[model samples]
Target: MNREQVEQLKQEYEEKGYCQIKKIFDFSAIKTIQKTLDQAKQESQISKEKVTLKLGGIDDIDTNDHAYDLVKYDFVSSFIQEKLALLNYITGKNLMIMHNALFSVEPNHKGLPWHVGVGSFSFTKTEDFGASIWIPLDKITKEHRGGMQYVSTKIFPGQFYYSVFDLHLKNNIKWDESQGDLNEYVANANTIYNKITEDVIDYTIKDGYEEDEYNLGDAFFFNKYVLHQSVPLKPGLHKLRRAFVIRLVDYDTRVDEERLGLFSKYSQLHSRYYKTLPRYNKDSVLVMVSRAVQKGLKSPYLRDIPHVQQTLAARMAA
Candidate 1:
């Protein structure tokens, strides 16, 4: 794109609170990354040594369904690291990636309920800028609707989501004693914390939301506050629709350790679909910053930058 084209994109992103950049990557780049991803998938599932979720079968939530530590390979980390400058230019913020993973939508899968990004992933504190770059490795065709559906910021801008989605998800949890029923908690959580009923789902889609279409390497970045959900997948040609999710925040973002761990406590209890990772009982990377402590970083994470990038370097070597 020309300078003027980039400027237009910036302006559009500012207004809409999201932007889709078509053909932002070469298809050949995707092929190489997929090769690495496939290899990594097998190793992590089989390697008992890996500090990851258990390789739970069909009904697993995000963990096994998505392979974390996705920024391990030279090709992968550089994918985000190289884009930092451009992302900053386009979004007009000094952004750095906080989390990334290789994710999938399986055949015959029903879609996820609509929800905002807050309390959805790690690093809870909001920043002036935060968003996710979702890039699919597969060619997303009409037959294979392996993309997300999102509410346009125009119809219901991000600012409005916090009260309904973010606050609702976070405000209730004050860390009370809960050696109580996990089964009952999950069932109730759906109506309360997640808060998206069948009626709301239909209403939101019918009212306004785009079913996305993307060619391989096509991607979109949506503001953190935007409400989104996975588009359902039927017996599409592909068995698994794999994608890369890179979550970013302005470089200066930070959060207290206690608050960082707070979401994990609630999140673990909120799901019932799959077995928890072996040590998920341990405090989250948010709660226990042993490595961060060992590294002698006084300021808490996105000081995590060093801690996580170090994992990438270590894993790449392994």
Candidate 2:
């Protein structure tokens, strides 16, 4: 794009909180990244558990050093860095990546509910901000059923933003303070929290929300304060929707460990789905399990654990 075009996009982003750049990557580039991800899942340690969820797919790999190493393919890192540079230019802030993930949506899968990437409860200066870059490996339209739908920040400003974390805290849903298997604790909390929050989600989906029709190699970046959700996967489409997301935060973002400490106490009770990876403190161990589950019911590794067996049974009941 020319300088004028780029400047216009920056203005659009500032107003809407998001902007899309199409065909910046070619099909082959997306294919290479997808192939690398496939190989990583097969070779990475976290894949052994077969952990998968509806919205985010696998949760266990984000913090694993090997997972990060896998995506460090020369093309992947450079591609992301190039895009991050554009984002920096638009925001005029020194930005660094805060999270990365490959999200997959399967046929018949229910989509993620509306939520902001950043939280209102964090201790950062009010001006500290972030953005999410979502790149789809395949074509996505309303018909295919996995395009992202977003509401402009112009309509719903930052201070009014309230995420599931706030709702969970307000509703008195919480995790047991006593510690056990951290993974199991998170899984249990997720199941309960998902059930409770379903009714309240649609209230945030207003009329002005818009969905993008993206072809291979197209990408969009939205501010952390913008509200967004995924379109549901239609049954019988027989197509899997795969997307790579890079979350970036501006330089000088600071954490109020105490405020975050208070928030985490109630927030973790909800599913890992409620929050993004960057929401946690940089060194927190929960950050690790936040990306992966303990054990799949079908996995032989968990066959001996009675809690695992019982939990599987309970899922059947749910």
Candidate 3:
């Protein structure tokens, strides 16, 4: 981890509520993580009942007949530790944590809808939640498929905006495309994306790195309220877009679930799922389901940055 870079990141995160740090890991290390992810997928079992709950583009959630075991692998254990530091630094809590997910976008993989994370804001005292670090395991660009874009301003406020599909899933009803196709609905949804982008900056990192690109080890920290989007990649190909989310609640944020309207409904589903689990605490429980990937679960699919966690934790104690 670059101390100077992190310090600079701290400044940017406060101003724009986000920052991007380049080269957080070795570019060559990508293969090891990807292979581990493959192995985990091979060993994991799937449940039919929970099948509808699974969302594509990542390994954070499990959707089989049985709930997928997220932390079954040791590879992700250390990684979550490292990101926890950044979360603490930004949120000011040793409880600072991450929703670790391996977002590998393959051909025809439509990324998530444009929406900010709501629960993350409740802790911050304001709408601006902490930032997320997206570490791409492979070369990424618009032409080659990239990460999702986040809308910066808090216009469509309260909670993260989600698609109506979420309701259909819970009810076990099929999506109504008779009004229009999925793509068209998404296109209309992006009206919000475009409207938000008009208020802030939109930067696309095309032609990601030249032959002499530095250690793609850098990381990008961004605010949750920022409107962002990802481009599609070619099919049958894989890009390692592993992300570690550090939820920083600005000292006194209380997330009002009801204000979020549609998001409030989803929040109910989140709570319902955790209530079934034994020994769940509210603080940890919210972090676990809200971010999708809670602590303790490991994925060969993602790399852990232990050093970052140690640095933040040790200094915070001082």
Candidate 4:
């Protein structure tokens, strides 16, 4: 983007809590990342690997899956390093890409409930920033609108609650109300705080943007403080919407014990919810954390990752 365009994007991001950048990545890059994920999925399935990507006790929790540091795939790291420069330019904060996640929703699938990403990130300090770059691999069209529903912070004022880096207002997970069924869990604009607006979580967000029709290379970014969820697909033979969600944290990001305990709750809930699925691998996020601890690991952050470490060094140097 040109200087003027970047300025406008920054202003919109600050006001709305999200922004979409068109054609930030080209088709070649998208396909490369997609191929990497596809190969990994096939390899994982063919080997009957019980690779668990999850959380555990404070010390044992890690950013890396036991089977592989998935983000280390060549282009994955390069794509992030590329974003680092552009995102920093936009946000005016020294930032580094910290985590990567991949998900695909098939036809008729109801996506996630509303919640900020704070609990999942396991951050030690959130003073600077946290944002996500969500990109879809499939061509999003009217027929396959890989939907994303979100509440603009401008309208709902998420900063009134999530502005705090520690995520203290996010304390209650409504365990008894949902009973491991996350969709039933009320994670909305004002569920716990109950101030700005009424809470709802029925796969139908009231008066929010039903964002979709974005094609390859479009990057939809949101400040992690914004409340967002996936859209349910109408019944069809359209291909599953496979999205790559990359988390970017400002420089000086670290993990702490407090978040570990809180994340344990998040993982247990997810483990329970997914196990109810017919084809879920049945591996526990809880179990992985315990196993990591037993192996004498000290930190949850994967500082040993070659590209990540390189990225960290670049951040400090800048």
**Candidate 3 TM-score, C-alpha based:** 0.49
Clashes of 2: 4
Per-residue lDDT tens digits of candidate 3, residues 42-137? 664433222122321112222111212333213443443455565456534443333333344455554443334432342232333444555555
How many pairs in model 4 have backbone atoms within 3 A of each other, for residues 3 or more apart or on separate chains, i.e. clashes? 1
For all predicted structures, in order, the TM-scores are 0.75, 0.64, 0.49, 0.67
Judging by lDDT, tell me the better candidate of 1 and 3.
1
Best model per TM-score: 1
> CA shift at 59, candidate 4, in angstroms?
26
**Model 4: which ten-residue window has the lowest total lDDT?**
55-64
Residue pairs with colliding backbones in model 1 are: none
Better of 3 and 4 by lDDT: 4
Total backbone collisions for each predicted model? 0, 4, 39, 1
Q: Give the C-alpha lDDT of model 3.
A: 0.39
Stretches off by above 4 angstroms in model 4 are 45-69, 126-128, 159-210, 235-237, 265-311, 314-318
Ranking by TM-score: 1, 4, 2, 3
Best by lDDT: 1
lDDT of each: 0.57, 0.54, 0.39, 0.55
Error of 1 at 237 (Å): 1.8
